[PDB]
Symmetry: D3
Amino acid sequence: ANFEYIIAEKRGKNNTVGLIQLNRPKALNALCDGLIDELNQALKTFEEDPAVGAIVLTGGDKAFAAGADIKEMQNLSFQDCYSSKFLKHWDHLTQVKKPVIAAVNGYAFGGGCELAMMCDIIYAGEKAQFAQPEILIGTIPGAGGTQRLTRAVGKSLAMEMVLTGDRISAQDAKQAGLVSKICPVETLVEEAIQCAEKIASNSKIVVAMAKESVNAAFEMTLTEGSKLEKKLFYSTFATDDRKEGMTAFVEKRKANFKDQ
Amino acid sequence: ANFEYIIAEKRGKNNTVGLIQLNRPKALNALCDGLIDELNQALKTFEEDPAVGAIVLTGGDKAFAAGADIKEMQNLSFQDCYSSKFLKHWDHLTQVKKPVIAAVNGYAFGGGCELAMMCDIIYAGEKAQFAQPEILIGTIPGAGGTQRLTRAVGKSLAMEMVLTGDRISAQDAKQAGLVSKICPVETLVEEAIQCAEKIASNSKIVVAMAKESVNAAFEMTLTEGSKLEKKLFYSTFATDDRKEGMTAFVEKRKANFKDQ
Amino acid sequence: ANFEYIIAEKRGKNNTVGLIQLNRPKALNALCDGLIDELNQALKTFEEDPAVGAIVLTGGDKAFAAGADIKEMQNLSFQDCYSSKFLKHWDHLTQVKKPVIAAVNGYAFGGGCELAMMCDIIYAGEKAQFAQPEILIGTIPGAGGTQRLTRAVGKSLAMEMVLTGDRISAQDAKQAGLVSKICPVETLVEEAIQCAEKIASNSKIVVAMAKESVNAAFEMTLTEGSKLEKKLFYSTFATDDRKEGMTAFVEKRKANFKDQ
Amino acid sequence: ANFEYIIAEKRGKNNTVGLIQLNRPKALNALCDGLIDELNQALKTFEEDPAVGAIVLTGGDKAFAAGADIKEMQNLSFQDCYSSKFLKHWDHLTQVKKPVIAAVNGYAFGGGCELAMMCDIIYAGEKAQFAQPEILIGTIPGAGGTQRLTRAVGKSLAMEMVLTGDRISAQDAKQAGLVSKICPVETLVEEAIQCAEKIASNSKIVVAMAKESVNAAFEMTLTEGSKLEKKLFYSTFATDDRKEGMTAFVEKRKANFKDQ
Amino acid sequence: ANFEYIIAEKRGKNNTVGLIQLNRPKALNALCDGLIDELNQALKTFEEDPAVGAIVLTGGDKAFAAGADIKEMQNLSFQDCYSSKFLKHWDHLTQVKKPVIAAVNGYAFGGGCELAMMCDIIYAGEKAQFAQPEILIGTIPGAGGTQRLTRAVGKSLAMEMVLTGDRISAQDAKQAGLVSKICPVETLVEEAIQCAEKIASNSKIVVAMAKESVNAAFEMTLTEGSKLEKKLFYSTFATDDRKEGMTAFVEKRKANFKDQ
Amino acid sequence: ANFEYIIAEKRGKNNTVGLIQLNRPKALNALCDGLIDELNQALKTFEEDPAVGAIVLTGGDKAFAAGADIKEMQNLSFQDCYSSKFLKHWDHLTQVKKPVIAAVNGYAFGGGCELAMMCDIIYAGEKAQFAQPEILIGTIPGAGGTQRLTRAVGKSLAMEMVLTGDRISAQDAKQAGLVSKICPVETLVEEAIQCAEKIASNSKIVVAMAKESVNAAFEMTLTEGSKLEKKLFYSTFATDDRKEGMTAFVEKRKANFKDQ
Ligand SMILES: C/C=C/C(=O)SCCNC(=O)CCNC(=O)[C@H](O)C(C)(C)COP(=O)(O)OP(=O)(O)OC[C@H]1O[C@@H](n2cnc3c(N)ncnc32)[C@H](O)[C@@H]1OP(=O)(O)O
Ligand SMILES: C/C=C/C(=O)SCCNC(=O)CCNC(=O)[C@H](O)C(C)(C)COP(=O)(O)OP(=O)(O)OC[C@H]1O[C@@H](n2cnc3c(N)ncnc32)[C@H](O)[C@@H]1OP(=O)(O)O
Ligand SMILES: C/C=C/C(=O)SCCNC(=O)CCNC(=O)[C@H](O)C(C)(C)COP(=O)(O)OP(=O)(O)OC[C@H]1O[C@@H](n2cnc3c(N)ncnc32)[C@H](O)[C@@H]1OP(=O)(O)O
Ligand SMILES: C/C=C/C(=O)SCCNC(=O)CCNC(=O)[C@H](O)C(C)(C)COP(=O)(O)OP(=O)(O)OC[C@H]1O[C@@H](n2cnc3c(N)ncnc32)[C@H](O)[C@@H]1OP(=O)(O)O
Ligand SMILES: C/C=C/C(=O)SCCNC(=O)CCNC(=O)[C@H](O)C(C)(C)COP(=O)(O)OP(=O)(O)OC[C@H]1O[C@@H](n2cnc3c(N)ncnc32)[C@H](O)[C@@H]1OP(=O)(O)O
Ligand SMILES: C/C=C/C(=O)SCCNC(=O)CCNC(=O)[C@H](O)C(C)(C)COP(=O)(O)OP(=O)(O)OC[C@H]1O[C@@H](n2cnc3c(N)ncnc32)[C@H](O)[C@@H]1OP(=O)(O)O
Ligand SMILES: [Mg+2]
Ligand SMILES: [Mg+2]
């Protein structure tokens, strides 16, 4: 379309996967205001399309995202940030009911690591790096860089990456638990599209319920989490795809889900 | 005894280890109602026996448990699931004060992985695979498959395993935090019995207090957890086994605990 | 000062690192009342000094800390725990706003792993062993050996280490998420001092805000944690170090923070 | 039936209300093991009856319950109270999905106030008294006397009632929030039965979902509580009673629910 | 814009109060989709206006709001609600940073009480009635009717109002804690406008901070609530209104706040 | 002792009550640093005395406490508020294991209401007024004026008191849940001393455990709180005061507690 910083397109088989690529080779894909607004518009378009079942958010081959534009947040004060709700349009990815895959190739510093951790699945290349360099410019992460990273890779590693700003490899992120699969830099997007197609081959309402159940593991207790999980498991016996799946399991055949 | 789906026997030295083996190779150890009732009866028997200190739950050599029997809940609706307390007898592993060790050899999909995660120690074999294939039949896990899995392996890996139904190897569950030790297939049961003997060689009340203190790490905050742990530690100076152990450590000898 | 159980000195470049060494080779650095009081005094002195930006806590080359002194708690009862509260001065390390690095060489059993887990960054040697052998003396951990360890390495591994008393290696602790970097025994102190220098090379108020934001990940929920992180990010635009760092990032130059 | 401590009968219009009366005029309805077992059996019978929609738990005209029986717990030690779970049969009232009305007439001290607070609706008479006299015998409440009372009447009033053992009137309990309606002594049971009839006149599944939604306000946060409430509101559009009620609201007629 | 269901106008002296009046006497102010969209637009306009400091939400003299439009959600199924995010535009009131005052005169049943409880201050009239009639139509409250009500009036009164549908008076809501002041029907609007003027007579950033500090008392713990409150109290010494007010208090004069 | 801002003395029968009076008629008992240090020293002295069972904090007949001293915090900035941990000594009252009774006569504005709410039992006079007038000077409460007040009197009343600064009466605080008893101005001290005597007439360790169990109702969930209460009840069987009280109840005599 008329997007300036992102490239929106429908990739994959049968046009069931949405690919949002960050195209900004002049600032290492800086998360400016216009880029975030275009990303939110693309996410809304992909969430208002019954043909799309999964979204893949990727960047470039040398850098996924360099964070927020430091050259846009420099001449700001406390009143100009608190009475303008700075970085309020960055919590729109966590309100998406469709799965979002984060293909990370290259530098993922500052806002890039947060944007990747706000996704369901994090796929990184063989030459990917994750770090929190906010401490080097006199600030701290403010979009989920000290909450999800601490519960994902551990307290010690998160403390180190936040207080030192050191870069970790994809192997360290796989060992700790930040990423789920290491892929080559030239085939990461293809494997991400294949994973999004696997995901989009299932019932959309059941996928949304499963995503909510998994996300409810960081907001409540174990007992209440299991109770909400059992309630959502009870509330799925009233759909049409559950019975179809159980019938295709009993009788040896393929399951055709009707998204209902 | 008269068990139709399980094999209950007292194993280990001095008959201090309870072994519950699921024996039904005709459905890959389907978690039906009768099997769950027999498992609960065996757990109650092993909890009302002052000679058993630890329980070892195991399955077969090709499949630990293939989940709930889908050939029974196929003709169930929302009314037959909500006001019938479906799967209500599956929360008996979290109410047992004695440690339960899970020996996974083969396929542990859905209900098997849930029952494994509801145990304290998870021991898997080299030829073992863990997955949650609920998204392929039109439902979601409802017995702890989206809460205990996310807090162990990570958000990304849990999201992938839930939304794709893919199978992970024992090495992946070991490097992620789901399995604590990788063992051969032909020696997993013996090493699990040895671990249960090393557990049942200490004070039963102190072991139960330690189990409660460890399980309280997912039900509240860090400060409240530390305070409850300190209170449970203060509540140990009123028993005889703590004093016996301290005297044996000071005098450099062996401690004979009397479970009191 | 005139400390008999610890050695306090200002190490590092420009005397910006506080090295607290535990010198008790006769009891494997037993955590007695006097040693803990001296540790708290050293921590308060290093906290009330404007020239210290990070603290490095270490022990010996064969044992970091063998836990609490059993010779001072063997003849205690239940009434001697609520009244004249025991282990009440061990919660002075989690109240320090400056980063505390832990260098573990040798045995870290009981109270040693508990004091190491209360630190932000944990550095272990190639021949370091972490364990919670409280179940072998009739007691349970009482200073965070069942809350932070469970959330760090996982439920299964923590259950095993607590109910069996077995020792793990530095490689397993790094793979599970207990330590952040494995260093040689003869060069662990130098790398810890270098990490403390790299940490103290930034603004102290921003480092304290980052430490609090990371520590608030085990005391609140994800939604409330994100809002608290956004608040702490908004509350840094009123300082001079943030603007100095942003200017040094835009006008590419060395950043000189005034710790204000 | 054959109950020697309680009187179980089916009261109300069309035999839709269960009335459990504590009959022990010699011990002021002491909460012994036999009485609690009979109460649990009566609750199970009323929960396995499709004709009963609400339960009314009442006592006598001078005392509802005097608390735990002292003549059976005096010769008990720590190893006889922490083991075997003495207070494990008293939490069978919060696991009931049918509404339980607690008609409190007379003395409600110790375990009686807890048994009343473990119900949905608390009805008190004119000469009603609530107190926590456990502090006068050297113990503390252990069945919800310091958790629900603190969140119901306030911190200060609960602190006073726990640390002093003073008795409060029914008017003070109504002004604070302990009870919701003050009824005469001679007509308390009749008004409780009428309230139970008005409750049972609605769909049982909808009433159970509403009870779960209300009870989820003391175990979760407001943000996640609202999400669980919306999910349970979504999960009611698949039943017949919701459509029947909406049709009887649109067209001027009465709603006849089929409990499905 | 020109509204047909609500009346948006600037009231009070100096045009500092925004009054939203629900004008639908033909359906007792039914909370339909268009009415909620107009209410959200009016709230956004009043929140993006640098002259409005508080909002007063009111209805009519006989009914504030009769709840959600039942004549539009009757022909809805489980799929048409969970995959359409029904009632997703009703959480736009708890995201407003400016204080919202609710003036209830008449019937506030179902969605009316839910909309009133999402406001900071709740002002009711003499002939005002609050109830939850959702149980009489086959559904449950789904917009905060079982979470914000239970934590205000008590568990027993909330259970009664939810499972019986009974109507309470303004005196009961004042004695329980649902409303803050009882005012006449012909002067409730004027006193609400005066309260909004007294609220908007202070600094807007400090008012927003206090509102967030009070709202954080239901989403967090007391210990972390105190820490967040102390942080928000520290983060106010960098504004121009705090020092102005302190200087005016020291010099015994009036403080002229500039919202900065 | 030689206190210039407070008056410390032992009152009550047998010198079992510690009366701490705030004597500063020139500033309406301003909470300055010296006054807070003296209050903390007096609290520590009264908590380390085996002849003191309860503490009674009070002020004057015209004003209990006017809050923090504005004359020493006017020229403070964000750097002098985040650093040095300003107001860190105001959290020494919530760490006392002995009950603290608050006698409020006159004005209790700002810090006075916070110090009163940090106590267990709140006793106000007939001429007492509670308010949070921080919004009138440009700041917000920072010592529990927005966390305990919201849970005590409700959301609406707390919002009004914080955003308007209006003063409430003792009757409103009692009907809302802030205070527990209304007493005359000249006899409030005698009734508080009698309440402290009735509290100190029991076992100190059991009273401390009850206070902790009541305070754990604002930091944990309902299930976890009930479980911690049950654990404390089981631990109470390790002292002699419980057995003495039960024996005195069985043999119908007065119980003599020895705090062990
Ligand atoms: C809640 C959110 C919090 C935050 O995210 S705060 C910001 C956090 N991010 C950072 O602190 C670091 C951002 N980037 C860098 O430090 C470095 O770059 C790299 C480490 C990524 C390495 O890149 P290198 O090889 O050194 O080249 P280069 O010249 O510095 O970058 C090329 C162009 O990219 C612009 N750029 C890089 N990062 C940002 C950014 N965060 N905001 C705005 N622009 C950025 C640069 O300035 C420059 O542009 P020009 O040629 O015009 O000078
Ligand atoms: C809260 C609870 C949630 C849940 O657990 S929902 C259910 C989730 N679990 C699953 O979806 C796994 C279902 N099982 C399978 O997908 C496959 O099977 C396996 C991958 C485990 C193995 O496949 P293969 O090696 O090809 O063997 P095979 O012939 O399909 O199974 C052999 C026999 O075992 C029956 N069986 C397997 N799983 C179940 C099951 N979950 N419920 C009932 N029966 C099952 C089969 O049907 C068949 O039996 P027959 O010969 O009579 O056709
Ligand atoms: C809140 C939680 C509190 C707790 O931590 S409870 C206690 C938990 N900690 C433990 O259980 C560890 C106890 N220590 C040991 O088990 C062993 O030691 C080692 C595993 C560390 C192996 O050390 P080895 O090579 O076998 O030599 P050695 O002779 O036992 O130790 C040398 C000296 O060190 C003293 N010592 C060791 N640990 C402690 C301790 N925890 N408290 C007091 N002293 C200790 C010993 O007794 C002995 O001293 P001497 O030669 O005078 O007899
Ligand atoms: C997890 C929960 C733990 C708990 O709840 S512990 C319970 C807390 N402690 C109490 O409730 C005891 C306090 N009760 C009393 O002091 C008095 O009772 C009353 C306040 C109820 C007033 O009744 P009055 O008639 O004045 O005294 P009376 O003569 O002792 O009562 C008549 C009969 O009732 C028996 N009884 C009273 N309370 C209990 C009880 N809590 N447990 C067992 N029996 C009780 C008595 O013993 C006696 O019977 P007999 O004289 O023939 O022996
Ligand atoms: C998350 C959301 C949850 C919910 O809110 S679900 C819905 C829950 N709310 C209710 O159930 C309230 C419904 N009960 C009533 O509406 C009763 O009535 C009253 C208690 C308010 C008594 O009012 P009365 O004096 O009997 O008059 P009248 O029957 O209401 O006629 C007035 C006109 O107002 C329409 N109306 C009233 N409430 C609603 C509504 N909630 N939705 C749609 N229309 C409503 C009526 O139908 C009728 O209209 P016409 O004259 O055209 O028949
Ligand atoms: C985390 C905590 C945050 C906070 O607590 S902020 C402080 C509480 N916030 C407030 O805004 C409270 C202040 N408002 C007042 O203090 C009013 O006064 C009163 C309503 C309490 C009393 O009014 P009146 O009867 O007219 O007496 P008066 O002449 O103003 O006070 C007599 C002397 O007392 C000094 N004083 C009163 N409050 C404070 C205070 N909070 N800090 C310091 N001094 C105070 C005054 O200034 C004056 O003294 P002089 O005669 O020497 O001028
Ligand atoms: Mg891990
Ligand atoms: Mg109240």
